[PDB]
Amino acid sequence: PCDSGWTLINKGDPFCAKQQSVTGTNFATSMTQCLNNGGKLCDLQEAVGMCQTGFIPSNTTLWISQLADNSSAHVINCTSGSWSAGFYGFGVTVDGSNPILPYCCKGRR
Amino acid sequence: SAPCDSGWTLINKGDPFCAKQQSVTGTNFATSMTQCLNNGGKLCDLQEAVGMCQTGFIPSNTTLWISQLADNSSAHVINCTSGSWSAGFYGFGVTVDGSNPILPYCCKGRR
Amino acid sequence: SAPCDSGWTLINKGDPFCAKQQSVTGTNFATSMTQCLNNGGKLCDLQEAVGMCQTGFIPSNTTLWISQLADNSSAHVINCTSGSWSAGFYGFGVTVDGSNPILPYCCKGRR
């Protein structure tokens, strides 16, 4: 159901996700990279589903698609299956001990 | 040739989608989302709730979670009354909006 | 077959999706959402607007609503100029962003 390099996440309506980088990347760069790879930054529920599946490693922070304000965006941290929310300015690349990784999601093919 | 899974209902607003009421009891945000994800769907976003209210699939005077955070600790709810909608927000652990219970509704794509 | 319906354009950015400018004059948030819902779609989200700007579908110096709320009374807008985007927020009844009319854009899934 997913293109080469993507993974079928079986939560909600199953979708396809991919960790796009191992480097800490800012918000706009994350979104643009994912858009160039035929996908989008995952929303809140897709992040929660990937965390519940174990697809996202424990204690990992990623940018989700929601804005916190005109100059900030929300991050989701995944640890031991549970999710927590935060936000940062568009230019931030490191959420405490975790570099903020870009994760792309897209529909089933 | 059914447009939805059994237990789900086609809402003809925007691109028609499939909605289902998960529970009749007030439920917090995290449990709402987890139950929707475990029922093959996800929490309805703002426009899906507006469509379900305009169609009448959501009865008058109904408060339900939507899939947008209000801050790191809160999420938005939508109240539906007399065919019109209004937005509010509440902490994750909250299960009640005034006299109304915050009910979980799930949405997914038309099949 | 055709990826989009008559009037809608396939946007080749992110998950490729069908889009349509719903009006040429400033429209408030609620009327924008209602027009989109009544014409088979919904207000585009943040990444859909960013893609439409990066592909050139959105002309330069264009402000449009998106589907996210900034609070219970306001919604976010995206302005596209050159290849780049910026985020603002305005009350539901606002029609103009500075000297830019707030235009409604509808988005939906392909095929």
Author numbering:
A (entry chain A): 519 to 627
B (entry chain C), C (entry chain B): 517 to 627
Task: Please give sentences taken from the publication describing this entry.
Bdellovibrio bacteriovorus is a bacterium that preys upon a wide range of other Gram-negative bacteria, entering their periplasm and consuming them from within. Proteomic and structural analyses of vesicle contents reveal several fibre-like proteins, which we name the mosaic adhesive trimer (MAT) superfamily, and show localization on the predator surface before prey encounter. Structural studies reveal a variety of domain usages (and therefore binding capabilities) at the fibre C-termini, placing these on intertwined trimeric β-prisms. Using independent but complementary approaches, we identified and characterized a MAT superfamily of trimeric fibre proteins with diverse adhesive tips, able to fulfil the long-sought-after role of multiplicity of molecular recognition and handling of diverse epitopes (across a wide prey range), by the bacterial predator B. bacteriovorus.
